[PDB]
């Protein structure tokens, strides 16, 4: 019975991975990453067919649900492993400029290819929140912000977080980065201007952390360079329909439930 | 003048620093500390004076009023200091076995000694979750129930959770852990008998953590090794006359507001 | 004017039966009992007004400061009586679990209450020595253990001790019973550990007693049974942080101020 | 017309039998015994009804006025005759830890009983000194001391003795017994502290003769054992406020009025 | 499946129990009760499971239509086994004034349980005359009077009876026990008016019978006291619109079936 | 009857185990331990006695005479077995900071223990080179130099080595390690003036070696890293009125015997 | 009148007892003894002496004098002394000289024989160099066929600009390091500080009373602690005390010391 294999580095953030071997095409899983937001190439999910067998085909559904960001790999390929060591490239894909959401990859072998392991395999950088829904052998109530990326970092280390959101809001919004270490008030990190013109920044962080947005795949992306320890905190994302006022507490009117940064000495 | 000067890893759980310097024996602050209840060694609390002076004594009150669980040190050192770099022992405290409540620890120094900075540091490490109520120099209620420890660990470390009282119940309860990630409902993790005799564990956490109590102490607590990203998630404990329904999210007749546990990748 | 009445087989261990009129709160008045250590059903305590007057309510505040152990009675009822031969329960109350302490009973009555005597009176056998405060009605520092149960007893016949603390230690007791009659040495009779799970008794009582304690209320208990007039003697409580040492006269660390027991024949 | 009937053994001290017929619970009977303290199995006290008669219902009260020591028996039957050799039950008892005082006993019959006879009769021995207030049938300052027990006993036997007080002290009471012989002095006989830890003897006595007290009860006992002829004399009870003092005639502040035993050879 | 348990002192008057497991809540069992009426503490009724399993709630329906006498127990606990000899509370419940008639009592295991039995048992005596309807798990007219009570006894023992009935009449009746031997006639024994206020006996069994009624449970009772052999017969217990006229054979409308009642030297 | 049993990592330097056993405080043993001149946390010394019994005390001398280098644990236990294998602590002892010289360990075990084993063992380590003088249970000439430390060890480590002294002079001395292989010349290793504020290092080992002295314990000491095959020699320590001279072969007034050190490959 | 009257002691008159008493010098006791302070500066001086007063003229084959004293503690000897005799008691004769240099505490035997006898009528021990000890001594003969303690020694009575030095010696020696200081108590007057000195010696504080004036020093080696007073004043009367601490800093403070002497007295008149 066919079990999922895929990257360590990824979190479950809503859905769970039994959606992603269950039949259906509308129950899915959305991931954050672990440590930076950015999906590197070698990054995999797939599935442990149990033993060596004689595959017709596949059928992987990625991509998930809803307007909203963009949530498919740019470049990869399909492989297929027998000491899950050594892979052998079935195909590979540029998916680059798909839009957000469900997409069916159906292949189909002639001549029924034998293999234990098969999988997707990142071949590119990818700054996206990475969403899928189905993975399967052929052998004949609202709207949510999302923050992603973070975890443990070393002193003077640069981490990047991303914000990623369910659906694809008709206006602009103001986009805002705040934290809260345990016990203290939220502060205000970063904000930006819905054009992505204006940025102003916290003087706590100005100089080392930069904000920016992908409007076109609808993401906003904080870079942390030469982090300390006085910024552990749990980093959210906020929107706001008004910059002025994007940077109080009491301005965004949806935020994000947070993404942990922790930096030791 | 003097300000607070403490253990960089500890928040404020409940009332707050100013308590501890309103020259007044019965308002005080309840600490928790991230990353592991314990108290290491090393850890202190005192003041920072503002300039060296000639000091004639100091009134420490630790701990703070009631009888739950324990809230005081072991084993623990006055030391002072010009420099903050240089400390030098006054004296050294055993306070084991001492009843929760205030501890008024009041010095002469017959020898007006001079320093910037005077602390109680911390000697042997301390599962409980420290109060304190004043700190001066001389110059011439329902029930609540809290988890402390907590915090960001990466995939295959330990982290050990406490959860302690306010109150002291003449009954004996059943206590249980239960976990809840966002979006996802609140899991069953591990209940414990009233006297320690009997636990459970749930499927995914079996053999990887561990529940005990210490009675006399009145803490409960959690020692999670092996940690794995699916750990992530509030850890609530519980209470419950009933061990058999302590496993069920409707047993417990009281809760703790959470604590917050992150393994990384 | 009105004055108290109470069970007679209890004596005052400590406080005045002032305290219990005085107005203050702070006052109090520690009993122990006669002949067997728990308190009945039917005890009571409360008032005689002296004549029959209306009652608009009572304030009653039971146990007393206390930081130590169980204090209060768990099931009782509030009665008045014209004549002192009839009794008409006005409320009923349950406190199991309470912490020890003193606990508030304040009672209004819309029509007033026609009423010569007004009382708390037990419902159910309580195994703890009871402590009281005030008693008014409505118109317009460091340790102590003690022993309490002692008393006279036919022989072949029971008896039940229990010792109590007046605070409690955050380190774990073993606890012994020992007795001496006049002129004689002072001779062990049974000792428990820490956690109650190992139990010794001297050769002369093997079979007769039983040793036990609740840790959860910080009572330990002597039952005494068949007993002879060979048994008469003053009974001790102590405390020594080793259980080994805990049946030698120079092992305890805190001993009791003891109740006499005298089996006649 | 009812006249009142009871043991043989018993004799009045207080006031006198008809005031036991007198339709008022203020007035009543204090009984002593004779040959032994303690009132035994069968012995009993209740009312000859003149002629066989129809009854509704009884109202009798037992133990006499006044808050002093206990005064009544701990299990009783209430039973009837026609011929007075044979008896039938009615209700039986179990006053055990009543207070000392009037306690009213008012039955009434489902169906109506006939009899010539009705009385209360003792079920088990009870070691105190019995009082009574009234007796009826249904047909639509200053304390006091008091010695009981003793009379006339063959050589080398067995007495106790016990005496009880009218009001009760909130002070405590070294008590003694001392007797007098016609002619000769008041002889010390046996001493006990208030908690009745200490005691001392007259060496004419040490080795065959007891003293016990019963704090709660309110009485003090002298057993005594194998008498002697010499024993003969008036046996009395004392107070005195000071152990110490208490074996000196001199020394007790109140003193009963004697009893009487005789030891023939 | 699974077999229904229940206590032994019990046999069913109407009903098959069959219908506690038929899945239907509106057919059930009445059970008289085998040697006097009262259930006592311990008794039972639950399941026999077959093989340990693992259950996630049962709902058990206790009680029976029809607004006839109470006819359930006030205190009781629903607890389960692995082994039939040990047993594990997972639910205590009051139902003290709970109206006659199906009550539906259902659970979930939040966790499974794994049992072999299950079942519900008495806590305190009740006085009534029990009634079931249906006993499941989850696992992923006229008028009748009836008699209950009653075997055999030893001579000179103690037995007690109940008449319980099917509906409640709104007119008010008088209530008489009688007994028949056979052959031998059916004899008078006892009644009571519809208010409790007037009795009359039998000549044969005065004093040693006693009638009673408690309207707010509709249930009559005989107290039998002092029992000889010729008690021995089946007792009939009556509704009679006219009490002058219970005592007659040719008086009473209503009759129950009879209970055996069987006394041996 | 009773064997001696001590730590195996120890060799007799002077007395024999039989001065241990032989019922005199005035003979003794004196030990140095091999691979380390310290002593390790559960090293011990004690008996075995070859059946199980009940002893009543124990009488150990710990220390022998003289007024020489420090000579005892300063945290240790008295622990006893009946298997060999767990151990029963009785008491712990802290002499921390005795004078050197023999020290009587007697207990009186008041209430009997039976053991096949009973022993003292060391709780924190020790850097000091221990002595004994006798254990016993109840059932009713020019100075000596002592080098310590020497065995075996292998390439790349690290071993320690002690010298203590059997008197302790007035007069206060520089000391000093040397070495000599087998075929070879006497090496100066390292010196240190009285006070311990000069030390000096042989060309072959400045930087690794340190040599140290507590003046108080009167003991010195050489710690060894990184240590290679060259190392190899017998060690001899060496005391020295002048420091200059200390250094060569000439100077010292007064040498030990050697530790004989090996390092291998 | 028929009397034989055994030799009898003698000493310098600057000492006296604290410990023991004479009798046991001349018991033949080597396991009893006398622990001596002295008046008026803490230090043996040379010439002073110990021995024995014969009675009259005698013929010794020799003598055995044991000096020191059953002790752990702290130096108990001279260091450098003559053994000498003399038949007027006004001038002497050197038997024997030794250098005792570097012993241990505790007691040395002098047994000496002499292949042609000595006739004497008195014979003694005599300092030769000033020792900075604190003497004891257990047996004096001719032939013929519990708890620590802490000591204060030196001083008594000594006028204005003056100078004196005290001692503490201890009967046990132990293994942990203790810091020392001392205190003086005035009549009816508080017990004041005075100084303190770390175990190790490298560390000291004086009380503004007294800074410049006094010195406070250590031997280790020896166990004794010294307490060099100079330029004196009336005001600086008063029972002076030694005392042990584990802690350097509550050394000074009238609590934090866990061991004091009984004190020596300190006199000043102008
Ligand atoms: C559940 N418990 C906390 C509790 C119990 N056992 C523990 N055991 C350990 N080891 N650690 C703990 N933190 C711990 N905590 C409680 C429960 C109630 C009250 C309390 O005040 N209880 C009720 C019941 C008493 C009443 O009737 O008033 C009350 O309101 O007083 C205090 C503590
Ligand atoms: C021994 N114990 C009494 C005690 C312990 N366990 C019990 N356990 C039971 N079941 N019943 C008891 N009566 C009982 N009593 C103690 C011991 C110390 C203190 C205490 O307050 N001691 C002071 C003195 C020293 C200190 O600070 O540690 C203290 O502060 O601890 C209280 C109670
Ligand atoms: C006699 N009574 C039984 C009855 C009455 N009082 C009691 N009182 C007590 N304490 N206990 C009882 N068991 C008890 N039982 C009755 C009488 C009639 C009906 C009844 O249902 N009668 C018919 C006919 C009478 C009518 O309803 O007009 C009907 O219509 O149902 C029920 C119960
Ligand atoms: C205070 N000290 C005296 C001491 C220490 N260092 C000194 N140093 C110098 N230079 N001069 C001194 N006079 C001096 N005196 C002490 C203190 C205690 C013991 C002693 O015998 N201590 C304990 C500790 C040993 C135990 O626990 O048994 C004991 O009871 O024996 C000895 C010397
Ligand atoms: C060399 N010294 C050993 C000594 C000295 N300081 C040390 N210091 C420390 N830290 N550790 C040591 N082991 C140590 N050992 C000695 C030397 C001689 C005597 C001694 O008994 N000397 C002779 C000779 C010198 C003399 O006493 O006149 C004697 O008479 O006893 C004692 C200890
Ligand atoms: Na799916
Ligand atoms: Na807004
Ligand atoms: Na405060
Ligand atoms: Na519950
Ligand atoms: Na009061
Ligand atoms: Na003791
Ligand atoms: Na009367
Ligand atoms: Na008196
Ligand atoms: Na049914
Ligand atoms: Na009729
Ligand atoms: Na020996
Ligand atoms: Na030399
Ligand atoms: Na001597
Ligand atoms: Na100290």
């Known amino acids: 019975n066919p079990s999922l294999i895929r990257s360590e580095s990824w979190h479950v953030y809503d859905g769970n991975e039994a959606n992603l071997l269950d039949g259906d095409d509308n129950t899915g899983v959305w991931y954050k990453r672990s440590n930076g937001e950015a999906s590197l190439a070698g990054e995999f999910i797939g599935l442990d067919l149990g033993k060596e067998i004689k595959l017709d085909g596949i059928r992987f559904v990625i991509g998930k649900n809803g307007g909203g960001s963009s949530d498919k790999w740019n470049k990869f390929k399909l492989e297929y492993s027998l000491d899950n060591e050594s892979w052998t490239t079935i195909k590979e894909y540029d998916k680059t400029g798909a839009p957000a959401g469900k997409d069916v990859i159906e292949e189909s072998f002639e001549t029924p290819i034998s293999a234990k392991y098969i999988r997707l395999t990142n071949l590119e950088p990818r700054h996206v929140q990475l969403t899928f829904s189905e993975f399967a052998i052929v052998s004949d109530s609202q709207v949510q912000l999302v923050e992603s990326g973070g975890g443990l970092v070393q002193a003077g280390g640069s981490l990047r977080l991303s914000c990623?959101?369910?659906?694809?809001?008709?206006?602009?919004?103001?986009?805002?980065?705040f934290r809260q270490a345990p016990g203290k008030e939220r502060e205000f990190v970063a904000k930006i201007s819905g054009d992505g013109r204006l940025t102003t920044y916290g003087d706590s962080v100005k100089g080392r952390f930069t904000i920016s947005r992908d409007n076109a795949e609808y993401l906003v992306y904080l870079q942390m360079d030469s982090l300390k320890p006085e910024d552990t905190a749990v980093?959210?994302?906020?929107?706001?329909?008004?910059?002025?006022?994007?940077?109080?507490?009491?301005?965004?009117?949806?935020?994000?439930?947070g993404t942990q940064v922790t930096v030791s000495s | 003048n003097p300000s607070l000067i403490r253990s960089e890893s500890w928040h404020v759980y409940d009332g707050n620093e100013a308590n501890l310097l309103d020259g007044d024996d019965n308002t005080g602050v309840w600490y928790k500390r991230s990353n592991g209840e314990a108290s290491l060694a090393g850890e202190f609390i005192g003041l920072d004076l503002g300039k060296e002076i000639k000091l004639d004594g100091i009134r420490f009150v630790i701990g703070k009023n009631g009888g739950g669980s324990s809230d005081k040190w072991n084993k623990f050192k006055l030391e002072y200091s010009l420099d903050n770099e240089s400390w030098t022992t006054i004296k050294e405290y055993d306070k084991t076995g001492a009843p929760a409540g205030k501890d008024v620890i009041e010095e002469s120094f017959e020898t007006p000694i001079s320093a910037k900075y005077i602390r109680l540091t911390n000697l042997e490490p301390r599962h409980v979750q420290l109060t304190f109520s004043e700190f001066a120099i001389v110059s011439d209620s329902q029930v609540q129930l809290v988890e402390s420890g907590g915090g960001l660990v990466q995939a295959g470390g330990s982290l050990r959770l406490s959860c302690?009282?306010?109150?002291?119940?003449?009954?004996?309860?059943?206590?249980?852990?239960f976990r809840q990630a966002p979006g996802k409902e609140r899991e069953f993790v591990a209940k414990i008998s009233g006297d320690g005799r009997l636990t459970t564990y749930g499927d995914s956490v079996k053999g990887r953590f561990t529940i005990s109590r210490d009675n006399a102490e009145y803490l409960v607590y959690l020692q999670m090794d092996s940690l794995k990203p699916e750990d992530t998630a509030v850890?609530?404990?519980?209470?419950?006359?009933?061990?058999?329904?302590?496993?069920?999210?409707?047993?417990?007749?009281?809760?703790?507001?959470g604590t917050q546990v992150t393994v990384s990748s | 004017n009105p004055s108290l009445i109470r069970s007679e087989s209890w004596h005052v261990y400590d406080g005045n039966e002032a305290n219990l009129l005085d107005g203050d709160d702070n006052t109090g008045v520690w009993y122990k009992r006669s002949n067997g250590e728990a308190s009945l059903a039917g005890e009571f305590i409360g008032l005689d007004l002296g004549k029959e007057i209306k009652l608009d309510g009572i304030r009653f505040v039971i146990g007393k400061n206390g930081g130590g152990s169980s204090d209060k009675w768990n099931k009782f009822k509030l009665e008045y009586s014209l004549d002192n031969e009839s009794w008409t329960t006005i409320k009923e109350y349950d406190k199991t679990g309470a912490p020890a302490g003193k606990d508030v009973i304040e009672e209004s009555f819309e029509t007033p209450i026609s009423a010569k005597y007004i009382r708390l009176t037990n419902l159910e056998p309580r195994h703890v020595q009871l402590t009281f405060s005030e008693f008014a009605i409505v118109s317009d520092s460091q340790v102590q253990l003690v022993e309490s149960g002692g008393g006279l007893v036919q022989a072949g016949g029971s008896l039940r001790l229990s010792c109590?603390?007046?605070?409690?230690?955050?380190?774990?007791?073993?606890?012994?019973?020992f007795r001496q009659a006049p002129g004689k040495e002072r001779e062990f009779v049974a000792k428990i550990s820490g956690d109650g799970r190992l139990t010794t008794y001297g050769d002369s009582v093997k079979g007769r007693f039983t040793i036990s304690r609740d840790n959860a209320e910080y009572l330990v208990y002597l039952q005494m049974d068949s007993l002879k007039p060979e048994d008469t003697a003053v009974?001790?409580?102590?405390?020594?942080?080793?259980?080994?040492?805990?049946?030698?006269?120079?092992?305890?660390?805190?001993?009791?101020?003891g109740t006499q027991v005298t089996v006649s024949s | 017309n009812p006249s009142l009937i009871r043991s043989e053994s018993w004799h009045v001290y207080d006031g006198n039998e008809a005031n036991l017929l007198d339709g008022d619970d203020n007035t009543g009977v204090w009984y002593k015994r004779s040959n032994g303290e303690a009132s035994l199995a069968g012995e009993f006290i209740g009312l000859d009804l003149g002629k066989e008669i129809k009854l509704d219902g009884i109202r009798f009260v037992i133990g006499k006025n006044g808050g002093g020591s206990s005064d009544k028996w701990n299990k009783f039957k209430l039973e009837y005759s026609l011929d007075n050799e044979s008896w039938t039950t009615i209700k039986e008892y179990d006053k055990t830890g009543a207070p000392a005082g009037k306690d009213v006993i008012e039955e009434s019959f489902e169906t109506p009983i006939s009899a010539k006879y009705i009385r209360l009769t003792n079920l088990e021995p009870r070691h105190v000194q019995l009082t009574f207030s009234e007796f009826a049938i249904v047909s639509d300052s200053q304390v006091q001391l008091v010695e009981s027990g003793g009379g006339l006993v063959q050589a080398g036997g067995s007495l106790r003795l016990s005496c009880?007080?009218?009001?009760?002290?909130?002070?405590?009471?070294?008590?003694?017994?001392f007797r007098q012989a016609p002619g000769k002095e008041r002889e010390f006989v046996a001493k006990i502290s208030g908690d009745g830890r200490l005691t001392t003897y007259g060496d004419s006595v040490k080795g065959r003769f007891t003293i016990s007290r019963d704090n709660a009860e309110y009485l003090v006992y002298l057993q005594m054992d194998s008498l002697k002829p010499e024993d003969t004399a008036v046996?009395?009870?004392?107070?005195?406020?000071?152990?110490?003092?208490?074996?000196?005639?001199?020394?007790?502040?109140?003193?009963?009025?004697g009893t009487q035993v005789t030891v023939s050879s | 499946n699974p077999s229904l348990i229940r206590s032994e002192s019990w046999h069913v008057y109407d009903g098959n129990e069959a219908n506690l497991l038929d899945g239907d809540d509106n057919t059930g069992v009445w059970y008289k009760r085998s040697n006097g009426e009262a259930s006592l503490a311990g008794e039972f009724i639950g399941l026999d499971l077959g093989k340990e399993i693992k259950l996630d709630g049962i709902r058990f329906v206790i009680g029976k239509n029809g607004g006839g006498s109470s006819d359930k127990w006030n205190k009781f606990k629903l607890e389960y086994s692995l082994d039939n000899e040990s047993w594990t509370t997972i639910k205590e419940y009051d139902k003290t004034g709970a109206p006659a008639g199906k009550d539906v009592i259902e659970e979930s295991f939040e966790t499974p349980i794994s049992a072999k039995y299950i079942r519900l048992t008495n806590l305190e005596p009740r006085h009534v005359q029990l009634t079931f309807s249906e006993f499941a798990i989850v696992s992923d007219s006229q008028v009748q009077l009836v008699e209950s009570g009653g075997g055999l006894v030893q001579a000179g023992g103690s037995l007690r009876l109940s008449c319980?009935?099917?509906?409640?009449?709104?007119?008010?009746?008088?209530?008489?026990?009688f007994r028949q031997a056979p052959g031998k006639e059916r004899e008078f024994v006892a009644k009571i008016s519809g208010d409790g206020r007037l009795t009359t006996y039998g000549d044969s069994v005065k004093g040693r019978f006693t009638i009673s009624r408690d309207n707010a449970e509709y249930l009559v009772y005989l107290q039998m006291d002092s029992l000889k052999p010729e008690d021995t017969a089946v007792?009939?217990?009556?509704?009679?619109?006219?009490?002058?006229?219970?005592?007659?054979?040719?008086?009473?409308?209503?009759?129950?079936?009879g209970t055996q009642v069987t006394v041996s030297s | 009857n009773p064997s001696l049993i001590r730590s195996e990592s120890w060799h007799v330097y002077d007395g024999n185990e039989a001065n241990l056993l032989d019922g005199d405080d005035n003979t003794g043993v004196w030990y140095k331990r091999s691979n380390g001149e310290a002593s390790l946390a559960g090293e011990f010394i004690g008996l075995d006695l070859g059946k199980e019994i009940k002893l009543d005390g124990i009488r150990f001398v710990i220390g022998k005479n003289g007024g020489g280098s420090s000579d005892k644990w300063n945290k240790f236990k008295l622990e006893y077995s009946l298997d060999n294998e767990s151990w029963t602590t009785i008491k712990e002892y802290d002499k921390t900071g005795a004078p050197a010289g023999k020290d009587v360990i007697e207990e009186s075990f008041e209430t009997p223990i039976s053991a096949k084993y009973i022993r003292l063992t060391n709780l924190e380590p020790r850097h000091v080179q221990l002595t004994f003088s006798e254990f016993a249970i109840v059932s009713d000439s020019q100075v000596q130099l002592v080098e310590s430390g020497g065995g075996l060890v292998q390439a790349g480590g690290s071993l320690r080595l002690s010298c203590a002294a059997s008197?302790?002079?007035?007069?206060?001395?520089?000391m000093a390690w040397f070495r000599q292989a087998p075929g070879k010349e006497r090496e100066f290793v390292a010196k240190i003036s009285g006070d311990g504020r000069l030390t000096t290092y042989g060309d072959s080992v400045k930087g690794r070696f340190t040599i140290s002295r507590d003046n108080a314990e009167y003991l010195v000491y050489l710690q060894m890293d990184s240590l290679k095959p060259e190392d190899t020699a017998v060690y001899y320590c060496?005391?020295?009125?002048?420091?200059?001279?200390?250094?060569?072969?000439?100077?010292?007034?007064?040498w030990g015997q050697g530790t004989q050190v090996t390092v291998s490959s | 009148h028929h009397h034989h009257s055994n030799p009898s002691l003698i000493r310098s008159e600057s000492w006296h007892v604290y410990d023991g008493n004479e009798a046991n010098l001349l018991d033949g006791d080597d396991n009893t003894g006398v622990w001596y302070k002295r008046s008026n500066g803490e230090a043996s001086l040379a010439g002073e002496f110990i021995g024995l007063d014969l009675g009259k003229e005698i013929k010794l084959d020799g003598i055995r004098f044991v000096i020191g004293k059953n002790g752990g503690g702290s130096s108990d000897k001279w260091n450098k002394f003559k053994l000498e005799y003399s038949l007027d008691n006004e001038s002497w004769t050197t038997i024997k000289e030794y250098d005792k240099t570097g012993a241990p505490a505790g007691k040395d035997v002098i047994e000496e024989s002499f292949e042609t006898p000595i006739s004497a009528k008195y014979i003694r021990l005599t300092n030769l160099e000033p020792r900075h000890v604190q003497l004891t001594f257990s047996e004096f003969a001719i032939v013929s066929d519990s708890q620590v303690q802490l000591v204060e020694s030196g001083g008594g009575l000594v006028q204005a600009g003056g100078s004196l030095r005290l001692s503490c010696?201890?009967?046990?020696?132990?293994?942990?390091?203790?810091?020392?200081?001392?205190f003086r108590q005035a009549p009816g007057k508080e017990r004041e500080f005075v100084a303190k000195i770390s175990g190790d010696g490298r560390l000291t504080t004086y009380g503004d009373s007294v800074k410049g004036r006094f010195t406070i020093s250590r031997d280790n080696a020896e166990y004794l602690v010294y307490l060099q007073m100079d330029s004196l004043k009336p005001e600086d009367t008063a029972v002076?005390?030694?005392?042990?601490?584990?802690?350097?800093?509550?050394?000074?403070?009238?609590?934090?010391?866990?061991?004091?002497?009984?004190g020596t007295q300190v006199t000043v008149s102008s």
């Open positions: 008197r302790r002079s007035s007069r206060s001395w520089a």
């Open positions: 060496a005391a020295d009125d002048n420091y200059v001279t200390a250094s060569w072969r000439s100077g010292p007034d007064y």
